[PDB]
Design an enzyme around this catalytic site. Structure first.
Site, short mmCIF file in Angstrom:
data_model
loop_
_atom_site.label_atom_id
_atom_site.label_comp_id
_atom_site.label_asym_id
_atom_site.label_seq_id
_atom_site.Cartn_x
_atom_site.Cartn_y
_atom_site.Cartn_z
N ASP A 1 -14.21 22.56 36.79
CA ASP A 1 -13.47 23.73 37.26
C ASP A 1 -13.75 24.20 38.68
O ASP A 1 -14.84 24.69 38.97
CB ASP A 1 -13.78 24.84 36.25
CG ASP A 1 -13.13 26.16 36.58
OD1 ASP A 1 -13.59 27.17 36.02
OD2 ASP A 1 -12.17 26.20 37.36
N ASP B 1 -6.95 25.78 41.34
CA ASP B 1 -7.85 25.81 40.18
C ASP B 1 -7.72 24.69 39.15
O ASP B 1 -6.84 24.72 38.30
CB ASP B 1 -7.65 27.17 39.50
CG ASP B 1 -8.73 27.49 38.50
OD1 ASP B 1 -8.65 28.60 37.92
OD2 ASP B 1 -9.63 26.65 38.29
#
Ligand SMILES: CCc1nc(N)nc(N)c1-c1ccc(NCc2cc(F)cc(F)c2)cc1
Length: 329
Positions: A31, A215
């Site tokens: 992430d 993201d």
């Protein structure tokens, strides 16, 4: 070094890392929207059903474990986990690094019972690391083995390889044409300036500019509630509790959606953003786009997640503080 990723329903992309001695295996999402590493802990009460359904790190079975104990809470847009800090050796695609990570002892059933992955490996900057823990990528950089201060993401469309992360470069086999880079609006966040968002023939959004967080840990593309309401009315989409749907028979003819980034238009077709599971006018099909009000200092901001990455191979450049995109192959 590259890590092979598994694609779960086009919404969860995860790979494996090994922690401790002997290695304890964990499924984790890489992430760029966070900076801490964490996995469920053996110390997590079994009253937390999510802990009953995931792999648990047991320090008492690892001889390379180093205790710390500092409490930490990690909050994401869709959920929060809490626990304490520990240190141990982590294996990431052949690479081995001593890393400080979170042993989660509080893992809410919603949403973690819906998580195929066990934990998370934050690929963000130390500036956003909770507890100011040194991120795993910085610890790998310190080793002086990677040919480049960069990592790359390839997210495949569902099927049946689900995806791939390359540490130290990019994999030419998964992109074509050349990269086009956009400098970060600041170090410490994988966020770039976005010059506009167009739906069909009309830049009806982000005129005057806006922010775009790239993201890898976000399943969809998100925008402020305001922006999304406007984007959806234009799509003729109806809002539900957690998402936006359109009559499936309308899915195929929804207009393109483009994002103006660094002097290049990144366009998605309805096939790229609608979960086309039927063509029935009697059924509702969800869109891989929705509202997400990201609080400051990061937000307000749009977030370009898996929906965007599936079409554009993404390279995160730490050395030059920028992000590069290329047509995924
Ligand atoms: C990978 C860490 C993460 N990073 C970012 N940048 N955003 C997130 N929302 C999360 C994050 C994603 C999924 C989950 N839980 C899993 C889940 C969430 C949901 F909103 C619906 C589901 F069905 C399943 C928790 C946190």
């Amino acid at each position: 070094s590259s890590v092979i990723l598994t694609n779960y329903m086009d919404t969860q992309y995860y790979g494996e890392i090994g922690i401790g001695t002997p290695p304890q295996t964990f499924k984790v999402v890489f992430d760029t929207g966070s900076s801490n590493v964490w996995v469920p802990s053996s110390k997590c009460s079994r009253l937390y059903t999510a802990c009953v359904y995931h792999k648990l790190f047991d320090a008492s079975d690892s001889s390379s474990y180093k205790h710390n104990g500092t409490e930490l809470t990690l909050r994401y847009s869709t959920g929060t986990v809490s626990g304490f800090l520990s240190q141990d050796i982590i294996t990431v695609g052949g690479i081995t690094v001593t890393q400080m990570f979170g042993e989660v002892t509080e893992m809410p059933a919603l949403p973690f019972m819906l998580a195929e992955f066990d934990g998370v490996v934050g690929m963000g900057f130390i500036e956003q690391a909770i507890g100011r823990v040194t991120p795993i990528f910085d610890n790998i950089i310190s080793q002086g083995v990677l040919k480049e201060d960069v990592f790359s993401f390839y997210y495949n469309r569902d099927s049946e390889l689900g995806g791939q992360i390359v540490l130290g470069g990019s994999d030419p086999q998964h992109y074509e044409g050349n990269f086009h880079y956009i400098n970060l609006i600041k170090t410490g966040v994988w966020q770039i300036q976005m010059k506009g968002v167009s739906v069909g023939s009309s830049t009806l959004l982000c005129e005057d500019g806006c922010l775009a967080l790239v993201d890898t840990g976000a399943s969809y593309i998100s925008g402020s509630t305001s922006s999304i309401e406007k984007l959806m009315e234009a799509l003729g989409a109806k809002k539900r509790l957690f998402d936006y749907v359109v009559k499936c028979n309308e899915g195929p003819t929804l207009p393109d959606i483009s994002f103006h980034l660094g002097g290049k238009e990144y366009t998605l077709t309805s096939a790229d953003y609608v979960f086309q599971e039927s063509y029935s006018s009697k059924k509702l099909c969800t869109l891989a786009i929705h509202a997400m009000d990201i609080p400051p200092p990061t937000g307000p901001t749009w977030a370009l997640g898996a929906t965007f990455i599936r079409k554009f191979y993404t390279e995160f450049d730490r050395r030059n503080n920028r992000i590069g995109f290329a047509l995924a192959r």
